[PDB]
C-alpha cells in the first residue's frame, strides 16, 4: 500500500544467476497482491570504493508497490542472501513509471 | 643490494619534531632520518634547518638505492615542511607529485582538555 524504490548491489561472481533471484523476488511480491511498476538493470559498474574487497558489482533498481509484510519478507531475503551486498529501501509517494536515467 | 627506480618520501611534520622517511612503492622503507639524529637536540628540533639537514642525510642514504624520482607525501602541521621539499629538490630528485595526507576525523573521539598556560 506504498511505493518503494529498491537499489541492490550484487556480486559480479554471482551475477551470472541474477535472472533467477530477480524472478523469484518478483514472484514473491506477486504472491500477496503484487505491483512491480519498474525493474531495471543498470549494468556492471565499478564501485567508487572497495566494498568487502569487491572493486565492481552489478546494480539493480526496482520501483514496486507492496504491502508491509512483503516489505519485511523482501528485507529479510536481501539480508540473508550473500550475493546481494548493499541494499537501499526508500519510501516514495506516487508512482514513477518513466524510464530512469543511467539505464541507457 | 636491491635497487628501485621509483621512490616515495613521507615527511611527518610536528610541532615538537620533524621526520623524513624514504621508501619504495608498496611501502617498504629504505632509509630514515630525524632532527635529533643529526645533533640539534632539544627545542631546536622544531627548527626548519634541522629538517633541511635531515632531508640531506635521507637523500644521501637513498642515493645508494639510486631512485632518481620520488613522490612526496607531507603529513601533519609543522615548520620545515617546505624546507624538506626544498632540500630534496636541491639534492636533485625528481618530484612526480606532492600531496597532503593529513587525516581529518568525522567527529570521532574526544580530544584532551585545553591548557591554562
Amino acid at each position: 500500500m506504498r511505493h518503494y524504490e529498491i537499489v541492490l548491489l550484487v556480486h559480479p561472481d554471482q551475477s551470472d544467476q541474477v535472472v533467477g533471484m530477480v524472478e523469484r523476488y518478483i514472484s514473491q511480491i506477486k504472491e500477496a497482491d503484487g505491483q512491480i511498476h519498474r525493474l531495471e538493470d543498470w549494468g556492471r559498474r565499478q564501485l567508487a570504493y572497495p566494498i568487502n574487497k569487491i572493486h565492481k558489482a552489478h546494480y539493480i533498481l526496482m520501483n514496486v508497490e507492496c504491502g508491509q509484510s512483503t516489505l519485511d519478507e523482501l528485507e529479510e531475503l536481501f539480508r540473508y542472501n550473500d550475493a546481494i551486498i548493499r541494499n537501499l529501501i526508500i519510501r516514495r509517494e506516487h508512482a514513477i513509471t518513466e524510464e530512469s536515467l543511467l539505464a541507457k | 643490494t636491491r635497487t628501485v627506480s621509483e621512490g616515495v618520501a613521507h615527511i611527518h611534520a610536528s610541532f615538537n619534531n620533524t621526520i623524513v622517511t624514504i621508501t619504495d612503492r608498496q611501502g617498504n622503507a629504505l632509509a630514515w632520518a630525524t632532527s635529533g639524529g643529526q645533533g640539534f637536540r632539544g627545542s631546536r628540533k622544531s627548527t626548519p634547518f634541522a629538517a633541511q639537514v635531515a632531508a640531506e642525510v635521507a637523500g644521501k642514504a637513498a642515493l645508494d638505492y639510486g631512485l632518481k624520482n620520488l613522490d612526496v607525501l607531507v603529513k601533519g602541521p609543522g615548520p620545515g615542511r617546505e624546507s624538506a621539499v626544498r632540500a630534496l629538490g636541491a639534492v636533485g630528485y625528481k618530484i612526480n607529485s606532492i600531496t597532503d595526507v593529513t587525516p581529518i576525523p568525522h567527529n570521532g573521539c574526544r580530544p584532551p582538555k585545553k591548557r591554562r598556560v
Partner: protein, 52 residues
C-alpha cells in the same frame, strides 16, 4: 533532484568531495538541503567517493 544524477551532483561537489556551500553555489535553502541529502545517499550507494 535525486542521488542517481552524478553529473549534476558533481557540479555542487568539490574536488575533495566536500559539499559546496550555498554561499558559493548561490542556491536556495530547500534546494541545498535536497542536494546534500542526494549527495549523502549517492556516496552511500558508492557512486561518488566520501573523500579523495
Amino acid at each position: 533532484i535525486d542521488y542517481k544524477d552524478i553529473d549534476t551532483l558533481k557540479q555542487y561537489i568539490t574536488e575533495n568531495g566536500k559539499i559546496v556551500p550555498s554561499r558559493i553555489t548561490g542556491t536556495k535553502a530547500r534546494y541545498q538541503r535536497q542536494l546534500a541529502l542526494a549527495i549523502k545517499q549517492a556516496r552511500y550507494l558508492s557512486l561518488i567517493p566520501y573523500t579523495d
